[PDB]
Structure formats: structure tokens, C-alpha cells
A paper describes a structure:
Voltage-gated sodium (NaV) channels generate rapid sodium influx to initiate and propagate action potentials in excitable cells. NaV1.3 is involved in numerous physiological processes including neuronal development, hormone secretion and pain perception. NaVs are composed of a large pore-forming α-subunit and regulatory β-subunits. Here we report structures of human NaV1.3/β1/β2 in complex with clinically-used drug bulleyaconitine A and selective antagonist ICA121431.
To investigate the selectivity and inhibition mechanism of ICA, we determined the cryo-EM structure of NaV1.3/β1/β2-ICA at 3.4-Å resolution. Notably, a strong piece of density was found inside the extracellular aqueous cleft of VSDIV, which is absent in the map of NaV1.3/β1/β2-BLA and agrees well with the ICA molecule. The small sidechains of G1603 on S3 helix (G1603S3) and A1626S4 create room to accommodate the thiazole headgroup. The anionic thiazole directly interacts with three of six gating charges (i.e., R2−R4) through electrostatic interactions. The middle benzene ring contacts L1563S2 and M1604S3 via van der Waals interactions. The protruding diphenyl tail of ICA outside of the binding cleft is further stabilized by R1560S2 and F1605S3. Interestingly, a possible lipid molecule helps to stabilize the hydrophobic tail at a distance of ~4 Å, suggesting that lipid may be involved in this drug-channel interaction. Our structure of the NaV1.3-ICA complex illustrates that, despite high overall structure similarity, S1559 and R1560 are the key determinants for the selective inhibition of ICA on NaV1.3/NaV1.1, which is supported by significant potency reduction of ICA on the S1559Y and R1560W mutants by 9-fold and 33-fold, respectively. Most of the key residues around the receptor site assume nearly identical conformations, R4 of NaV1.3-ICA was slightly pulled upward by the anionic thiazole group. This observation suggests that the ICA binding stabilizes VSDIV in the activated conformation. As a result, the IFM-motif binds to its receptor site, and the activation gate becomes non-conductive for hydrated Na+.
Numbering used by the authors:
A (entry chain D): 116 to 209, 212 to 283, 313 to 438, 741 to 987, 1189 to 1778
B (entry chain C): 27 to 148
C (entry chain B): 20 to 192
Write the structure that this text describes.
Amino acid sequence: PVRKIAIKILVHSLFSMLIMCTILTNCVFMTLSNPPDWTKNVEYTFTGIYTFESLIKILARGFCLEDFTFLRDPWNWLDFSVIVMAYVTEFVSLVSALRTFRVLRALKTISVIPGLKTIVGALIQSVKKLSDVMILTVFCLSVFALIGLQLFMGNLRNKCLQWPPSFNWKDYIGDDSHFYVLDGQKDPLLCGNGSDAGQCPEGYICVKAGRNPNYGYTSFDTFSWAFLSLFRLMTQDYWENLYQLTLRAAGKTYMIFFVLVIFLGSFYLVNLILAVVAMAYEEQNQATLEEADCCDAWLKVKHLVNLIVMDPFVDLAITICIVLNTLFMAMEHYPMTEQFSSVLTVGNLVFTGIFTAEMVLKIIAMDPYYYFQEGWNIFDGIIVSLSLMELGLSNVEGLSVLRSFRLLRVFKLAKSWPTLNMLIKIIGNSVGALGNLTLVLAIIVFIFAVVGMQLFGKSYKECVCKINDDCTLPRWHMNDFFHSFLIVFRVLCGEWIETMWDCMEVAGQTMCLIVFMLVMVIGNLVVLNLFLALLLSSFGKIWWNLRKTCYSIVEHNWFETFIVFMILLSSGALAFEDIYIEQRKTIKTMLEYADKVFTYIFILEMLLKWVAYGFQTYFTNAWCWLDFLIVDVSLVSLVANALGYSELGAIKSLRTLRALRPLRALSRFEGMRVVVNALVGAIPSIMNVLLVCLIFWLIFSIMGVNLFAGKFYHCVNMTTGNMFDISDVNNLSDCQALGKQARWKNVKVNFDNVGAGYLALLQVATFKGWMDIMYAAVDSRDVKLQPVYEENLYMYLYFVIFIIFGSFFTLNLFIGVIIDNFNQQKKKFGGQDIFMTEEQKKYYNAMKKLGSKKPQKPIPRPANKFQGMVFDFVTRQVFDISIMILICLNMVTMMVETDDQGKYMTLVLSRINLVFIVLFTGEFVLKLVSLRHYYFTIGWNIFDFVVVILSIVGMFLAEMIEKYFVSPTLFRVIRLARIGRILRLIKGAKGIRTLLFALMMSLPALFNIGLLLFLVMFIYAIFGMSNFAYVKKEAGIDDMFNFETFGNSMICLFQITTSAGWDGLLAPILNSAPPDCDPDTIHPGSSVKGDCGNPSVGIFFFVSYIIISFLVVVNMYIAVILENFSVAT
Amino acid sequence: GRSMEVTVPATLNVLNGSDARLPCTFNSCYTVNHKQFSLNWTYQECNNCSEEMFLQFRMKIINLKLERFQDRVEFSGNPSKYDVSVMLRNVQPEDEGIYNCYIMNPPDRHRGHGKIHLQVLM
Amino acid sequence: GCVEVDSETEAVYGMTFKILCISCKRRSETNAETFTEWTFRQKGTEEFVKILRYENEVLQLEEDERFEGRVVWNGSRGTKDLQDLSIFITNVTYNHSGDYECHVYRLLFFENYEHNTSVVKKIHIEVVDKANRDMASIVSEIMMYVLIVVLTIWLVAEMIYCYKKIAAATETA
Ligand SMILES: *[C@@H]1O[C@H](CO)[C@@H](O[C@@H]2O[C@H](CO)[C@@H](O[C@@H]3O[C@H](CO)[C@@H](O)[C@H](O)[C@@H]3O)[C@H](O)[C@H]2NC(C)=O)[C@H](O)[C@H]1NC(C)=O
Ligand SMILES: O=C(Nc1ccc(S(=O)(=O)Nc2nccs2)cc1)C(c1ccccc1)c1ccccc1
Ligand SMILES: *[C@@H]1O[C@H](CO)[C@@H](O[C@@H]2O[C@H](CO)[C@@H](O)[C@H](O)[C@H]2NC(C)=O)[C@H](O)[C@H]1NC(C)=O
Ligand SMILES: *[C@@H]1O[C@H](CO)[C@@H](O)[C@H](O)[C@H]1NC(C)=O
Ligand SMILES: *[C@@H]1O[C@H](CO)[C@@H](O)[C@H](O)[C@H]1NC(C)=O
Ligand SMILES: *[C@@H]1O[C@H](CO)[C@@H](O)[C@H](O)[C@H]1NC(C)=O
Ligand SMILES: *[C@@H]1O[C@H](CO)[C@@H](O)[C@H](O)[C@H]1NC(C)=O
Ligand SMILES: *[C@@H]1O[C@H](CO)[C@@H](O)[C@H](O)[C@H]1NC(C)=O
């Protein structure tokens, strides 16, 4: 016929390649920010070609006057959509809806190559298995959201308000100039009336009046806003700020709430999402894998060169020269004196020369073009050629940074190193076998990128001064394609809310909500799938006589418990050494003498341990050796202050080692003992992987030193703390000629050398700190030149690349090797369940026996007179489904609650939930009449009973508080029985029950690991109290959250525990010199001096806490995943 | 941005004798405030003749009704939703010329404009 | 930051002393200009007569003989924002032993809103010829010794009890 002609064209591979290339070039064309006139014609061409393919498909599966052919293929639906609304778009008056037409062409990128279809489908089945976890996640988010809503109902609205000299209260609340705008924040400061809350300055009072602490955004005074804020808490995006605002409004006492959600909403639900995605991917892998003359001279010199000593002290010498080359790369300082830069450049020339020499020696013993077959030789040739090109040019502008590719020589160590070879294998799998999936990621990111622009770009250009002070575009916009990619990449990283606020203030609420939620769901699902994909591809008369007695003393339970109590009291003795210690003068001396008592007890128990266990056995024990060291430092302190060297710079600095006193509790407790045993047993492989990670971050940090060698130095106007304009000041010369108002300030985190390079890369990879790092690196123009706003705008790519490699691949290898090590440890050598002791093991086994229990219908009929009637007409489906419907309706009534709802609305809701509580009491009593004898065989019945009792008691308590001595801060807390009234949902909600049971199963191991973590926070909080209770009031450290007291230190360390905002807490400590801090500022009521902590101990403190918390949280994660696997498989 | 977008047409002709509604509205982003807005209408008489004044409303309801051209203008705008316009009292053979509608919105920095030839057809 | 500490009540005759009065700001970041007055009544008098005044740089004194050439300033040194108010009294005598009132008047600056706050700190001192140790310190030291000796007795008693047990038990073989 004639359709047969339109078949060969359809299946011909050149047609598919044409479609691929036209989609790719159209995609490159959507990148354009402001398309010139002529491009329009090309755009027409594109849609014409698209019509082409549709024609080819529409004359291929329908014959003899047939209408629809490509409508059983879902992607053909998208093709039909784009071809139709392209010509609908061709009628411009038929409109500001281009944003819904161009994006349809944007989504067409998915089907560039066959194979992405299967990957998208596989992602679809992966998200299909997310039903139970997503429903549990939304339920928990809603529950904690109502908790936060009825607790902080409008407290986040609290602000400082002046006290008037005397319309009245109408244009006083709504002035926004009568509020305390904290300097350099452009957002009114929060306060509160209760204690342990934000303090309104002298001359202000805290009033619940104004907008919420943003442009009017994710606060707690609405259920929708509460749900958004707790989705933010569940993803932990910038939750330091929500933490700070909530605790500044409602008081520090409420922080326990966060400890719940952070441990329950974020820590647990993320783990469950990861675990179920992992099970889906493992099932996918299991299914897929179970389914399937002159030649005489040349040869005579080859005789020697191939015989030139290969293994002894040459190839090993070549490797050690590679290591020395990396070393010479390391000493790249920013502040450089001559005769040092000369040394480095002559060493670099020597090394590129020796590499060229060895290459020409290896291409005359394996032939010039037979040599390019091992693969490693190809890589060596490419890298040596790049080095030779760099030395030859030495004059290219903007591209001398290609120099850094010489660091690729480090990867030659992969020939010997097995673990870095595993890293290279993971990279190859990312680009190779799983590259399709990786491609999807990029494509999806690209899609959202362009989509974002088409939906928001123009808006961000016109609505700009709505969000700014200079009305120029913010540093994170979508006006051009690159920034739209950057925002999507940042959303993938996890920092979404800060830009989402800007979007929602520029381009309305619903559009940006939908866009950013779609990105955060789809893109993170893709990223997690890729991460797990690479993860799963990893694989005599007195002596003895007294000795026995003292052994019986030291082994007895009485003495051990007394010693444990002394440990707790001695550790607590440090907590009272506040900023407020001198004001007491009674606890001060009391704890001073308690120090002597505790040291005496400690020395005596050490002596009994000495005389009982014996010196050899007491020094073969790590715990006893550590205890002896701590007793030694305590005894040295006692000798010092008895003799009188107390106020000596070295001895007083040694006094801060008292913070290690709680460390001896590790041995006495079972939980810390077993958890530290597991950690320090797994520490060798962790150390090997850490060696690999510091090697690869050394590569990236030396690259960063080359890219940003001390170019961060920017002038600042010392009356406002702001950068200069390029016009007024350009470089170092005029910055030194700008009187004294110019500082030539640094960034305090930079790339001056591999040390600061490691610090900055740690901040970037943890994603909490990259703000000023990226901003200044992009600002970086050149040495001694003042930075310019987004001048070197493409340096973002570097960080992007780093985050892909040094934070997504390195952490991937780290987690994979930890998975392998723990697998080996639990299965082969050791107990099957680490992090739990023997008694905890018995608890776990008894709970396992308890969980798989069901009743063998031991409920006979009641006695007489219609009790059996209700008994038998209550058990049926009707009653249970009805009570769940009433629970859900009560939940919906709960969500209606809002700030500033009229007294009538409160009365209506009170009547409605009176109706609900009565209908639940009559229900409880119906089941009672059904089962008057016992009714307590199953814990769900006793849960219903206790929750109904709690609701009634809370109801009466609310009435009492509302017609007696009244306090709203107690009413809000006591109103929490309704939360259990809706938690009653768990009884019949299958799936949720199993996952919460997994929580209950993992609770012992999580408790042990979290007890070790709490001890770690205790030690670090006391050390910070000793050190950083005196730092300046910079960004992260302020009056409310700082290291002054123990409560403030513990809340700061809880903020840090999830790596949140530790950049802000490290910023003030990094101050070292008079320009930033001041070494002699006498504090009122303190004999101490100086308001800046020691930088070295500051970095050590924060980086050590980050690493220890990361290891502890990884142990928690592994425990949860183990529980999920055990319950499921 | 480059300018301020105005939904102004090219040229519109209104029959004589009827009441004249002279429209010029701009679709901006920023939430409107009825206290600080700026609005000045211009017109080009000769090739490069300097304007004197055409309309007013630069701080509040301010009217001109100048006898230089005609007796006209009635406030028929409502800036509440990006829509401010006026009227003209009597379309006559003395209603011809290029009558611009320059604008200025305070919270942004763009002086937008729209040019239409006020004439008569039939 | 800043901490409010109650000054020591017991001074010493003939020695020196430092009367403390710390009025910490509610917010540490607020720029302010602070000055103060110190008004003392002696034991046996019922009034509060001005004796010391502190302003931006130099303090002024009333011409009372009880403090002429005798009191110096140990507040915050030249910061225009005092936040620390202590009088260092040299060669303490009997004629200053009674009640001080510490009126700290702080003009808090703000964006455009000037505040004029006043806070009173009533401190009590009693000059004494002999600097006896405070009750808290003596009780603390005595209880320290009691705890040490009691625990030593406890451990020696436990050792002797276990010695009796092992003598009764191991003597069999
Ligand atoms: C924290 O405690 C302060 C101290 O009482 C509370 O200040 C009180 O604020 C309310 C309004 O927020 C004042 O009510 C009056 O309302 C009329 C209009 O009905 C208005 O004309 C008055 O000027 C005044 O605003 C009340 O007088 C005021 N109390 C005092 C002693 O100043 C504040 O509301 C509390 N905030 C929270 C969140 O607990
Ligand atoms: O209505 C009332 N009090 C009330 C309190 C809180 C809630 S509540 O919305 O916050 N839900 C809750 N669940 C657990 C705790 S509170 C609802 C109602 C009183 C009432 C007033 C007028 C007519 C009828 C009753 C009342 C007084 C004595 C005994 C009961 C009720
Ligand atoms: C630093 O910038 C100043 C800018 O003033 C340079 O001084 C000269 O400035 C004038 C006008 O400002 C320019 O026309 C000259 O071109 C500048 N000189 C040069 C050599 O370019 C100053 O030279 C700069 N110095 C450094 C070290 O960058
Ligand atoms: C410092 O800031 C002030 C702000 O008013 C400005 O006037 C001054 O010019 C700046 N100083 C410089 C850049 O010389
Ligand atoms: C103390 O004051 C009394 C007032 O009567 C005076 O007589 C006496 O000399 C004073 N002594 C000293 C040491 O100032
Ligand atoms: C108190 O004042 C004396 C005398 O002026 C001075 O020597 C001493 O250093 C001061 N002490 C403090 C803490 O200001
Ligand atoms: C203090 O005064 C007494 C007598 O009033 C005198 O004996 C003593 O030396 C004085 N001490 C000082 C330090 O002035
Ligand atoms: C207000 O400030 C002035 C400034 O000198 C001061 O004299 C006055 O005592 C202050 N007001 C009060 C009530 O103290």
C-alpha cells in the first residue's frame, strides 16, 4: 500500500538519530536566556520536525483512513501533547501561557535514547513500593505538625515592640518601624514572655503582632504552614533557623520537641525511605540477575630499554616520584616568597620532564602505537601531553587552571592501591554500566532547570526588588539557564527552602510549591537510586590473702554502683562551671571541694585496682589505662593547686582537660562499652577509606589552591561591614590608600593552602558552610584584585564537580566499605546484633517473640440480656471502619485550628471535639460491655483505654486552667492528649504498624548509640564551655544560642549533631587577631580576658565533633537498616 | 528588566460624539500602593517639540482640564489591580495627535511608556 | 557576655575592697551611653546621700570626708557603655559600713528610638576587723573532710570484713 512507505522511514536508524539530534539541539536552544529574533525561525523548524515524526507515526499504525495510531504508547501521549500545543501556541492571541507550552517541549528530552524509557519505568516501580513509607511519613508529619501548631500557635509572630509615649493599636502593630530590626537581617527580631526565651531589650516588649519571621512563610500558625515547616524539619534544610526562631519565641524549654522530630521525623523517616528504596533496588537486582640496519638498531636498543631495570627501584621509584610530585603540589601556599615559588616550579618542570622521559622510554620498548592498548598508557599519555601543553603555553588567560589536570597523575597510584582502584571502578560504573541512569539524572535536572526558567525566569527579573535591598537579582535566581541549573542542583543537595521563599515571593505560592516539591521528590529519588545503585555494586601469707579481699571489693556490685554514681556526680560537677558560676559563690566552693573528694575516691579505687588486678593486667587493659591517665591528670592538677601553680598558662590550660572526666563512664556502662567496641573494631577499614578520601580531597584541595590562591581578600567599609564597589576601589593599592576604613579582610575560610583547603572542602561537602565559600570563589577575580559580583561566575561548576565527586562518590565508597565491614563483623566474627549487650539481647529476643502474637479467639459470648447482641454487632467491619472515620474526622477538625481564630470558631471546635470525645467514650464502653471481664489481652485495647482517660483528664484540666489561676503556656502543653486521640489510628493502619514496630525493635541499639552520643555531647559541651563561652557574638553564636552555660552549649551541640549550621558556630571562633576579636576585653563579672577562642582548637573541636557525630549517626543508620532487613527479609 | 510592560495597542479610533474612554494600563508585579505612584502623560506636537503637560495624578487625584486643547478628562481608573485610566469629555475634530501614556511605579525602577495616535475614523 | 554578681558583704578594716554592681543589658548588641550614681547610708543613718557619680570618662565625687582620696573606679574602662559598676575602696574604714544604692542610668540607643532606663541595685556591706571565712566555705571544707574520713572508714571496714571472711574460708586448705 502507501503506509508501507511510512514504515521503513519509521524504523530506519537514521530517522531515530535525526530525532535524537533535533531534540538535543532544541534542548541547547531552550538554554538561551533572551532569544534573538532569528532563533524564532529555527524554533518553528523544530516543531515542524516534531510534526514530521508524528506524521511518520500516524501513517504507521493506522491504515485506510484511520485516526489514532500512536496512542497506546505513553510517551507518544507526550509527543501528541507537544505537537498539539505547539500549534496552539502558534496563535499568540489564543497569552502568558507559554510557560505551560514550552515546558511540554522541555519534558520531551526523556526519550532521546532508547533505554531511558526502561530506567524511568524502573524508577516508577521503585516509587510504587513507597506507599507505606510515604503514608507513615505524612501521618507523622501531620501529627508533629499539630503538636507544633498547638504549641507555637503564633509564637513565631512575637516581636519586639516599643513602648509608646502615650490609630491607637491599629497603626502601631502594622508600622514595622516600631519593631526591633536586628542589624543586618531585614527581619524583625523574635522574643517571648516566659523565661529561657528571647529577651526584649530595655525599652521594648514582646507582642504577638506582625508577619511571621520571613516574608510571611513557614511558621506554625496554620496546619498547612506547620506541615511545610515540619517537612523542612524532616529534610533538615536550614532547620537551624527554624530551631532558633522557635526557641527564641517559646523558650529553650521547648527544645525537647525538636529532639523528638529530629530523631523521629527526620532521622527515622529518612532511614525508612532509604531502607525501602534499598529493598526495592535489591529486588530489582535479584530479578535481573536471576533472569539471565635501522631495524637492527631499534631492536638492539629495545634490548636495553625493555631490560632497563623495571621493578627494582624504578617502577617503585616512579611511584614514589608520583607521591613526591603530589607533595610538591601540596606546598602551594598563597603567601609566597621567591626562592619558594621557584622551587615548586622547577620541581614541576623536573616532574613533567621525568614523565615525558619515561613515556618516550615506554614507547620504544612496546612500540609507538602498540603502547596505547593497556588503557593506563592512554591515560598517562593524555595527562603528560596536557602537562606539556601547559608548560608550553604559559600564556593562556582563564585556562591556565587546566594546569591542575597534572594532579590526575595521582590516579596512577590506582595501579598499586586497591581501594582507590575500587573508587575508580565506582566512577567507571557511574559513567559506564549505570551511565544511562546517571544520564537520566542530568536530563531530569536539565528539565527542571529549563522548566524553572520558563516558569519563573521573567518573574525573577521583574519581581526582583520584591526580594532584595538593592533590587538587583539575588545570587540564586532562575533568569538564565546556568542559575536555574544551580538552584536545581542546590535542591538536590538539600538547601531548598531558602530559594523556595524567594520563588514564592516572586512567582506566587502554588507554582513554586509545585515546582520545588516536584524537584525535591523526583530528583532526590533519582539521586538516591543512583547512590544505592553504585552502593550495591561495591562487591603469700598477706599478699595473696589481701589481694583476694581487695579483688572481692573491686568486683562487688555495691562498689561498682557506688563508683558509677561518683562518675555521674563528678561529671555533673563540671556542668555548674557556667558563665554564671561566680554569681553563686556557694555552689562554687562546694564543687571545688567535691573535686577533691572525687579525686580522692578515684585515686583510692585506682589503688585497689592496682593491688587486685596487678600492674601487668591493669596496664594491658585499655579502659584501665585510660582511667589511670585521667586519674594522673587529676592528681597533677591537685599537686598544682596545692603547691600553687594554678594561674600558670600551661597548668591552667591543662585544667580544661577536666572535661575528659566523663570519659571514664565508657567502661562502667554496658552500652557505651559495646558501642565503642564496635566502632574501634571497625575503625581500621574506616581509616583506610579515610586515607583514600584525604588523597582524593588532596587532589581537589590542590586544584582549589590553584584556582583560588588567596584571591578571596576583599575590602570592607569598616562603618557598615560591606564590600566596596569596583569603581571606588579596584585592587590592593587603592585599598591601602583608602585611609583606615578599609580592612582588606579575608574570608576566614579559604584555599590559601591544603589545610584551609580541607576545611573549605569539608564545609562544602557537608553542605553547611558553602555560602561564603561559593560566593567569594565566584567573586574571585585575581590576586590583590578586589572581587566582583559573579565575575568569575562559572567557578560554581568546580564546586558542583566537587560535590559530585568528593561528596557523592567518596561518601559512597565510605558507606559501601562500612557496609562490607559491618556485614563481615556481624556475620562471621562476632555477635549477630552489635550495639546491644547480653541483657539487651534478651530484651530483643523476648520482644521478637512478643511481636509475632495473635489471639486464638479466646473471647466467648457475654452472659445474658442483649450484651451478646452489642458484642456481636460491634466486632464487625462496620464499627471498626466507623471508628477510624471518626478518628480521621477528629484529625480534620484538629487541622482547622489556627492563630487569631474568633472565639466563636474556638467554641464550635470545642463543641465538635466534645462530640468526638463522647463518641469515643461510647465505644470504649461498648467494647467494655463486650468484654467486661478482662478487655486487656491486647495492648491496643489498653492503649485506647489510657488515651481516653488521658483525653478526659486533659479536658478537665483545661477547664480548670480556664476558670482558675490561668497560664496559656501550660494549657497548650496539657492539651496534648488529643495527639494520642489521633495516634489511635495506628491500630488498624497496616504497614505503618510494621514500620513503627521496626522502630520499637531498633530502640535498644539506638538507645545505646545515642547514649554514647550524649556522652560525646557532654564532653564536647564542657570543653566548649571551658573554651568558647567567651567568643564574640557573630552570626552563629548569639545571646540565646552560644557556649555560655550548659543548656546553651547542649542546644548548640544538638544543632551541630546533624551537621546543621556548624559554619555559623565556627565563624566567631575562627577570629584570632585584633581586627576581628580583641585579646583584652574584661568581661563584667569575670577575671578572664579575650573574646576569641583559639582557632586551632576551634577547628579541632568542630571537625572532631563532625566526624564523631557522623560515625555515630552512621552506626544508628546501620542499626535501623539491619532491623528493617531482619523484619522484612 | 529592559522596560515596564504595557498592554497598549498601536492605534485605536473612536467615533465622534460618543464619550471617550482613553485607556492605558500596565501589568506590573509589585503589590500596588495608592500613595506613592507616579503617572505623567505626554504628547509630541512637532518633530522635537518639548512637552508642557497632558495629564496628572502624580501624588493623588490631580486634574488639568487645560483649555489649550479641549475641556475633558474624568478619573476612570482603579490602581487596585494594575488598571489606571481616564476619560475625555467630547470627541471632536480637535482630538488628533500622538498621545503617550508614560508611567512610573515606585517600588521598581522602570519608566514605561505606551504610544497611541488618538484620531477619528468615520 | 555579662553576669550579675552580688558583691561581698563582709569587707575588712584597714585592707582594701571592691564593691560590685553589674547591670547587664537585656541585649548585648544594643549601643548605649551609660552613667551612674552611688548613694550610701551609714549604719545608724536613714537616708541615701549622693557620694559617687560616674560619667563617660571621669568620675566625680562628693566632698564627704568618708571617701575623700579613698575611692577609685573599677568599672568598665572607657567603653561609653558601662555594663559593669564597681567602686574600689582603699584602706577601708568603719565610716563606710551600711547600705549602698547603685543607680545605673542607661540611655539605650536604637535605630531612631532613644530610651532612658534606670535600674537600682541595693548592696549591703559591713566592715569587719577580721575577715572570717564565709559559712558556705567552712561547712564545705568540714563536709569534705567528713566525706573523706567516712569513706576511708567504710573501705577499711569492708577490707576487714572480707579479711574475716577469707580467714574463715581459706583456712580449710
Ligand atoms: C507578653 O506580655 C506583655 C506584658 O503584658 C503583653 O503585653 C500586652 O499586650 C496587649 C496586646 O498585645 C496589650 O493590650 C492592649 O490592647 C489594646 C487594644 O485592645 C491597645 O489599645 C493597648 O495599647 C494594648 O495593646 C496589653 O496592654 C499589654 N500589656 C502590658 C502590661 O503592656 C503581651 O501581649 C504578651 N505577649 C505574649 C505573646 O505573651
Ligand atoms: O468546651 C469546653 N472545654 C473544652 C476544652 C478544650 C477542647 S480541645 O479542642 O482543645 N480538645 C481537647 N482534647 C483533650 C484536651 S483538650 C474542647 C472543649 C467546656 C464547655 C463550654 C460550654 C458548653 C459545653 C462545654 C467544658 C467544661 C467542663 C467539662 C468539658 C467541657
Ligand atoms: C589598581 O587600580 C588603580 C585604579 O585607579 C590603578 O591606577 C590607575 O588608575 C587609573 C584610573 O583609576 C587607570 O586609568 C590606570 O590604568 C591605573 N593604572 C594602571 C597601571 O592600570 C593601579 O595601577 C592598580 N594597581 C594594581 C597593582 O592593580
Ligand atoms: C561607607 O558607607 C557609607 C554609607 O553611608 C558611605 O557613604 C561611604 O562612602 C562608605 N565609605 C567608603 C566606601 O568610602
Ligand atoms: C566618721 O564620722 C563621724 C561623724 O560624727 C566623725 O566624727 C568621725 O571623725 C569620722 N571618722 C572617720 C574615720 O572618717
Ligand atoms: C581596681 O583598682 C585598683 C586601683 O586603681 C587597680 O590597681 C586594680 O587593677 C583594679 N582592678 C580591677 C579589676 O579593675
Ligand atoms: C589606713 O589608715 C590607717 C589609720 O587610719 C593607717 O594606720 C594605715 O597605715 C592606712 N593604710 C593605708 C594603706 O593607707
Ligand atoms: C534621662 O536622661 C537624663 C540624661 O542626663 C538623666 O539626667 C535623667 O535622670 C534620665 N531620667 C531618669 C528618670 O533618670
